[PDB]
Design a protein around this nucleic acid. Structure first.
Ligand code: 5GP
Ligand code: 5GP
Ligand code: MG
Ligand code: MG
Ligand code: MG
Ligand code: MG
Ligand code: MG
Ligand code: MG
Ligand code: MG
Ligand code: MG
Ligand code: MG
Ligand code: MG
Ligand code: MG
Ligand code: MG
Ligand code: MG
Ligand code: MG
Ligand code: MG
Ligand code: MG
Ligand code: MG
Ligand code: MG
Ligand code: MG
Ligand code: MG
Ligand code: MG
Ligand code: MG
Ligand code: MG
Ligand code: MG
Ligand code: MG
Ligand code: MG
Ligand code: MG
Ligand code: MG
Ligand code: MG
Ligand code: MG
Ligand code: MG
Ligand code: MG
Ligand code: MG
Ligand code: MG
Ligand code: MG
Ligand code: MG
Ligand code: MG
Ligand code: MG
Ligand code: MG
Ligand code: MG
Ligand code: MG
Ligand code: MG
Ligand code: MG
Ligand code: MG
Ligand code: MG
Ligand code: MG
Ligand code: MG
Ligand code: MG
Ligand code: MG
Ligand code: MG
Ligand code: MG
Ligand code: MG
Ligand code: MG
Ligand code: MG
Ligand code: MG
Ligand code: MG
Ligand code: MG
Ligand code: MG
Ligand code: MG
Ligand code: MG
Lengths: 97, 118, 51, 110
RNA sequence: UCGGAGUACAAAAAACCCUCCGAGUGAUUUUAAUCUAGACAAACCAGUCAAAAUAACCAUAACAUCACUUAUUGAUCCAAAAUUUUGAUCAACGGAACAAGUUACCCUAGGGAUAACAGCGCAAUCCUGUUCUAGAGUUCCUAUCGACAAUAGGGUUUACGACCUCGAUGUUGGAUCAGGACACCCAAAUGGUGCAACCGCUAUUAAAGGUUCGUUUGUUCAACGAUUAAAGUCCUACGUGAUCUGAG
RNA sequence: GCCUAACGAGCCUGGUGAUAGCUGGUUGUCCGAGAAAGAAUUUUAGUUCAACCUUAAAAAUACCCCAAAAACCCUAAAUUCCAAUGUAUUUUUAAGAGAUAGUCUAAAAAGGUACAGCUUUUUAGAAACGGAUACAACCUUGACUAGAGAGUAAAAUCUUAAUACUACCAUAGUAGGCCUAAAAGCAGCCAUCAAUUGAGAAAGCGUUAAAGCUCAACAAAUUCACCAACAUAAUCCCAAAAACUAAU
RNA sequence: GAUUACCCCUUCUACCUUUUGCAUAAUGGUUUAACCAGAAAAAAUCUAACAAAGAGAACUUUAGCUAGAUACCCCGAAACCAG
């Protein structure tokens, strides 16, 4: 078994997980030309590609959301400054002083 | 009567020793969750079943990547007793468009960008 | 969490709206299939013999 | 045996529209047996203590001071027996109108 | 049949041959209209609210009020009035226009969905032990008991439940043959006695073997006669009717 | 009672294929989805609606849902309504049938015996071809096919069987004062001083009353010392056995 | 399941029906052969004709009319009446 040992060493808990024992092709022609790809390997590649695409999409969405929040806060600061900039000069209690 | 459970806030306040115990950065929280359903949803309430279904954890022992935002953290808190949560680590950065088809997710949580080159 | 409740507000909403619109379009594309002359005329081939 | 008549269906005396709900005119906001929620702005009171919106808008719930009708002998007695610093408070349900009263539209140039 | 409070602690709903209050209307005048948005509730039938607009009164209200106000009520059809309305402890209260008792002379279709016997669950009841000593025992709790209380166990009685059987598990008692348990009646080995001896009273250990014959009663029991070393308590479909009896 | 072997009323024929909410049966393969009950009812052995569900079709929001909001004497688990977010589900339209006689487990309750494999409500779960030896409901488990591949899950002998406390001498005012036949530390009531380096007008046995035997007191050494242990059933006990070779 | 090998080894509580639940000691059957049990087109769905009209007569029509295909068992009483 040794799933805990394999997890500690970094390998998959199952010897059939992404190891070279399964990722590599298991046969080829005696002439040296490569064999057609395995259906299981093709499906695993498709799933890994989908997972990577999802990871990239999630990271990009999180970055975009953080940037949008920062931009909103900055625009709030700018409009708060502009409200004071567009005001008038006080004359009520300042002219008698 | 058996109903849902409200988890008190002090449960999710990490101790300073917990960061070193679980290998987390005390300053910067991680960006992405790797969630893997371990236990079954049978003999569990329908709300837990529905949360598992909407989290994409219908199949067991298949990791799924999620965000680290409170909106999904609420559901992960609801079904935290049926899942294993790890941080997604990226030693070689995000996979580029030229490295999408040569990536893999190790059991220890780092998503390698170049997996069995050549 | 990586983001706060105020920071996550509407960070991914266009994607959800687009997904719902795609679901609606997929549902609305439901309609009977085309009937072609080949389908009707291919039944006569059951009596093809050798001259 | 000795106890009879204890069976009677519930009257569904409760709250129908919560805070933030967009209601139209005439919608029953909440029904009650005793005065639990009091009507406020744009909320009328029926003969059976039910509360119905009079204008189309958004339902809100507030805590406000209670000044009873001076002709209400019981409430006036309660008020006059209240101590110096005591002010009554009640939960009032309001409807905040959304649409404007009307619009000025051009019809013809004469 | 209808309503209120608890069950049902905080939106709604929510049952019991569950615990308590009530209703089948009175008093008084303000005698309380038409039409229509939008809503509550709801299987359906029914029940509830209600803005704006209309005719009469202040030219500023009309939701009839009070009795916990919530319940004070009944569908079609059909009968009667003067055409507008009315009529049911139809209270078995979603109501058949008008109908009882008995059957052991009974019949049929089913039910272990549902009782009587047995089994099964529980131990209210019953039976065993120990803990606690106030009291009896002349004095002295524990030689013999031991109230008020505690705790553990067995499944003999009655009851409780209705889980297996109603396309059948045939009943009391007795005859024949008995298997088993020990919570031992005798026989055997002992401890304490308020054990001088004989008789006795308790407790410990032990289940290979025994545990009578008769009058009355169908009797299990019970009373009585004569004896015995003793005439034990129970379980076994209250053992045993494809072995027997039919007294009940 | 008897009326041609069955008479609470003969037999035959016809109505007649009587009628059964009741029982029994209901005949090829494969695939998709798939339901445990709210209201009426001479009704609870049944039907008709609602809620679920199936088959097609239109659409658009559907569950999860942070604030904020939902009563007045006290009140828990938590509910209702809601953005965001994660998913793709939901609502209407047209055809519809089955079901409406339920079990346990966890939780809040009620009745009972704070009894049931008991009965009635509310929330959740289950009804494995693995485990709990056997097993409905308990635990593990998003249920296809072939392989003489692999990794995991729940799960496989449970805790104590315990309670010893030993020498050493105890004299005095005085039989303290009252009651009493007697009350000398001791049926009883009140005082509770004092001699000795050290001993209570005495904390338990004992005498009718005395005597006498101990405790505390000094003198001698002084391992440790507060509570805790509790019978049994009936055909024949019930895997066998094992206290140390490295086990997250 | 296997196996060189019939058993010996390991694993599986007959089948319908009725039930909350049956290996149940709840019902049914010795076996074979032959017979023995879903039937209707109002509204609807699909297909097609023609279409403000459809139908070979009588009707229906604010996209409708005409035609076709999709649907609803068997056995059993005690009884009642007439001759
Ligand atoms: N009183 C009354 N009788 C009615 C009604 N509808 C039908 N009926 C029937 O009409 C008949 C009247 O006869 P009555 O009782 O007057 O002699 C009874 O059979 C009664 O049941 C009604 O609405 N009221
Ligand atoms: N009323 C009802 N009966 C069911 C349901 N599921 C199964 N049954 C009944 O249960 C029996 C079969 O049990 P099961 O095979 O489902 O364990 C059959 O009598 C079947 O009709 C249900 O969801 N509702
Ligand atoms: Mg595969
Ligand atoms: Mg009530
Ligand atoms: Mg009710
Ligand atoms: Mg409603
Ligand atoms: Mg008005
Ligand atoms: Mg009735
Ligand atoms: Mg009725
Ligand atoms: Mg009713
Ligand atoms: Mg007689
Ligand atoms: Mg019969
Ligand atoms: Mg039943
Ligand atoms: Mg009996
Ligand atoms: Mg019997
Ligand atoms: Mg019985
Ligand atoms: Mg039996
Ligand atoms: Mg009982
Ligand atoms: Mg017991
Ligand atoms: Mg005495
Ligand atoms: Mg017995
Ligand atoms: Mg039964
Ligand atoms: Mg029952
Ligand atoms: Mg029977
Ligand atoms: Mg039989
Ligand atoms: Mg014997
Ligand atoms: Mg003995
Ligand atoms: Mg003896
Ligand atoms: Mg014997
Ligand atoms: Mg008995
Ligand atoms: Mg017998
Ligand atoms: Mg026999
Ligand atoms: Mg007999
Ligand atoms: Mg015989
Ligand atoms: Mg006789
Ligand atoms: Mg005859
Ligand atoms: Mg018939
Ligand atoms: Mg019936
Ligand atoms: Mg299927
Ligand atoms: Mg129906
Ligand atoms: Mg909230
Ligand atoms: Mg929402
Ligand atoms: Mg029924
Ligand atoms: Mg039960
Ligand atoms: Mg349930
Ligand atoms: Mg099921
Ligand atoms: Mg098994
Ligand atoms: Mg599964
Ligand atoms: Mg001295
Ligand atoms: Mg001494
Ligand atoms: Mg004994
Ligand atoms: Mg079984
Ligand atoms: Mg059934
Ligand atoms: Mg049964
Ligand atoms: Mg049986
Ligand atoms: Mg059975
Ligand atoms: Mg039967
Ligand atoms: Mg059988
Ligand atoms: Mg059968
Ligand atoms: Mg048979
Ligand atoms: Mg037709
Ligand atoms: Mg007749």
């Amino acid at each position: 078994a040794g799933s805990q040992w394999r997890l500690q060493q970094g390998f998959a808990a199952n010897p059939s997980g992404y190891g070279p024992l399964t990722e590599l092709p298991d046969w080829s022609y005696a002439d040296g030309r490569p064999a057609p790809p395995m259906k299981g390997q093709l499906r695993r590649k498709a799933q890994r590609e989908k997972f990577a695409r999802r990871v990239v999409l999630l990271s990009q969405e999180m970055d975009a959301g953080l940037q949008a929040w920062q931009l909103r806060q900055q625009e709030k600061l700018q409009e708060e400054e502009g409200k004071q900039k567009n005001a008038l000069k006080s004359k009520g209690a300042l002219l008698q002083n | 009567k058996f109903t849902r459970s409200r988890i008190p806030d002090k449960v999710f306040q990490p101790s300073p020793e917990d960061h070193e115990k679980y290998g987390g950065d005390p300053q910067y929280p991680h960006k992405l969750h790797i969630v893997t359903r371990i236990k079954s949803t049978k003999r569990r309430p329908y709300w837990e079943k529905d949360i598992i279904k909407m989290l994409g954890l219908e199949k067991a022992h298949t990791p799924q990547v999620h965000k680290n935002i409170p909106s999904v953290n609420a559901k992960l808190k609801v079904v935290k007793h049926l899942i294993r949560i790890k941080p997604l680590k990226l030693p070689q950065g995000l996979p580029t468009e030229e490295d999408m088809a040569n990536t893999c997710l190790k059991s220890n949580g780092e998503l390698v960008v170049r997996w069995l080159l050549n | 969490p990586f983001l706060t409740a105020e920071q996550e507000r509407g960070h991914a909403a266009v994607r959800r709206a687009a997904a719902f619109q795609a679901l609606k379009a997929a549902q609305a594309a439901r309609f009977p299939a085309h009937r072609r002359l080949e389908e009707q005329l291919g039944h006569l081939l059951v009596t093809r013999k050798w001259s | 045996s000795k106890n009879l008549g204890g069976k009677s269906p519930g009257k569904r005396f409760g709250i129908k529209k919560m805070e933030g709900h967009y209601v139209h005119a005439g919608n029953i906001l909440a029904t009650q047996r005793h005065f639990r929620w009091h009507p406020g702005a744009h909320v009328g009171l029926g003969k059976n203590k039910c509360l119905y919106a009079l204008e189309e808008g958004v339902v809100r719930y507030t805590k406000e001071v209670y000044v009873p009708n001076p002709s209400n002998s019981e409430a006036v007695d309660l008020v006059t027996r209240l101590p110096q610093g005591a002010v009554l408070y009640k939960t009032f349900v309001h409807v905040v109108p959304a649409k404007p009263e009307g619009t000025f539209k051009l019809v013809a140039m004469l």
